Amino acid sequence: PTREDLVATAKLFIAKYNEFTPESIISVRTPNSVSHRLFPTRNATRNIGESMEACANAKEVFKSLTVSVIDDNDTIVDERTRKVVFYLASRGDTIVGEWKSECIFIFQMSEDGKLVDRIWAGFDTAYMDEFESRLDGITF
Amino acid sequence: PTREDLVATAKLFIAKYNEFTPESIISVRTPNSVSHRLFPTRNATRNIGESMEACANAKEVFKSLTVSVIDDNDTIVDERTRKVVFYLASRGDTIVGEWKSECIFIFQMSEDGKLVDRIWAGFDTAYMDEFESRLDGITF
Numbered sequence: 001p002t003r004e005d006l007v008a009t010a011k012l013f014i015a016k017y018n019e020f021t022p023e024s025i026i027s028v029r030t031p032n033s034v035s036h037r038l039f040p041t042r043n044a045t046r047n048i049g050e051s052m053e054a055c056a057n058a059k060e061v062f063k064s065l066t067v068s069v070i071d072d073n074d075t076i077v078d079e080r081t082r083k084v085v086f087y088l089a090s091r092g093d094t095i096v097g098e099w100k101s102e103c104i105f106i107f108q109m110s111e112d113g114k115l116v117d118r119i120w121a122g123f124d125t126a127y128m129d130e131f132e133s134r135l136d137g138i139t140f
Numbered sequence: 141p142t143r144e145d146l147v148a149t150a151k152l153f154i155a156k157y158n159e160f161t162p163e164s165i166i167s168v169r170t171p172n173s174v175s176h177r178l179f180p181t182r183n184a185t186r187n188i189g190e191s192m193e194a195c196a197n198a199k200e201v202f203k204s205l206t207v208s209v210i211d212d213n214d215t216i217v218d219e220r221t222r223k224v225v226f227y228l229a230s231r232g233d234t235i236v237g238e239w240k241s242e243c244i245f246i247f248q249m250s251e252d253g254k255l256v257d258r259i260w261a262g263f264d265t266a267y268m269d270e271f272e273s274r275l276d277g278i279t280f
């Protein structure tokens with residue numbers, strides 16, 4: 001799997017991620033793939049089944065989601081470990097207004113390089129708390 | 141620079157980092173290097189002078205601080221862009237209590253591979269906020 005192969009699969013994962021349905025967000029993952037969150041405070045680990053369910057729940061708050069690579073020149077590819085790293089802007093339309101943040105995504109690809117076998121996600125965990133405070137303030 | 145060369149320079153940066161003096165935290169950096177903090181809530185860019193001043197400021201609060209690569213299997217190396225990614229455990233003692241967190245460090249090396257030429261650091265921003273809250277509450 002070439003450097004170009006690995007980037008393509010990760011960029012496909014991002015595309016289906018932005019479609020943001022439970023089926024689309026697993027469409028580029030292997031059956032035993034797991035998603036990890038970085039950092040202790042929002043730590044979490046999701047298999048395919050758990051990821052689908054987190055998506056359906058997140059859809060009750062996020063009306064629309066776009067993550068995009070900020071700069072293709074900052075992308076990191078490790079051909080030996082089949083890993084790709086993106087630094088991403090995150091943009092959301094939610095029931096309490098605008099979501100705007102950045103995150104880092106690390107993908108390890110399957111041996112053939114066509115699917116995502118493992119994900120690590122580093123989010124701005126202070127911003128998450130701030131967003132949850134916005135959610136907690138919904139007032140009829 | 142080989143894969144092994146890039147990792148060695150990054151491990152050396154960590155060794156000197158753990159000495160935690162202004163002289164040591166610059167001793168594996170090119171003089172025009174800049175250190176970026178990731179994530180909007182804590183975004184910052186520091187040249188060498190600013191890094192030395194920040195280390196001296198940190199030493200006013202931190203009695204001790206050590207970082208360590210948790211597992212060499214997590215490490216990511218891009219020979220073409222000369223980049224190394226570490227996932228680290230950070231541990232220290234401070235005037236407002238214990239420090240315990242994890243962070244992701246990204247290094248881009250110089251052309252010869254022997255020095256760090258740019259750094260990106262992703263911290264657990266909610267944990268930093270909580271730590272700053274302890275600092276912002278000093279009262280005698």
Ligand SMILES: COC(=O)[C@@]1(C)OC(=O)[C@H]2[C@](C)(C1=O)C(C)=C[C@H]1[C@]3(C)CCC(=O)C(C)(C)[C@H]3C(=O)[C@@H](O)[C@]21C
Pocket residue numbers: 017020025035046051054055058062065090101103119121123128
């Ligand atoms: C990285 O992929 C994931 O973490 C997946 C597998 O699990 C998730 O929970 C994802 C999830 C379900 C995952 O795929 C997806 C699709 C999106 C994650 C979002 C909503 C993406 C935008 C974000 O920055 C935040 C931090 C708001 C994310 C989450 O809250 C994640 O928690 C969420 C819902």
Ligand SMILES: COC(=O)[C@@]1(C)OC(=O)[C@H]2[C@](C)(C1=O)C(C)=C[C@H]1[C@]3(C)CCC(=O)C(C)(C)[C@H]3C(=O)[C@@H](O)[C@]21C
Pocket residue numbers: 165175177186191192194195198205230241243259261263268
């Ligand atoms: C790569 O090294 C760095 O990131 C340097 C150059 O810049 C920094 O910002 C570093 C800094 C100046 C950098 O060298 C150093 C020495 C330490 C960073 C600490 C104090 C390390 C422990 C941490 O987890 C926290 C989040 C408390 C760090 C910071 O606050 C960093 O912000 C700090 C002060």
Ligand SMILES: [Ca+2]
Pocket residue numbers: 196197200
């Ligand atoms: Ca000071």
Ligand SMILES: [Ca+2]
Pocket residue numbers: 199200201202203
């Ligand atoms: Ca002291």
Ligand SMILES: [Ca+2]
Pocket residue numbers: 272276
């Ligand atoms: Ca403050």
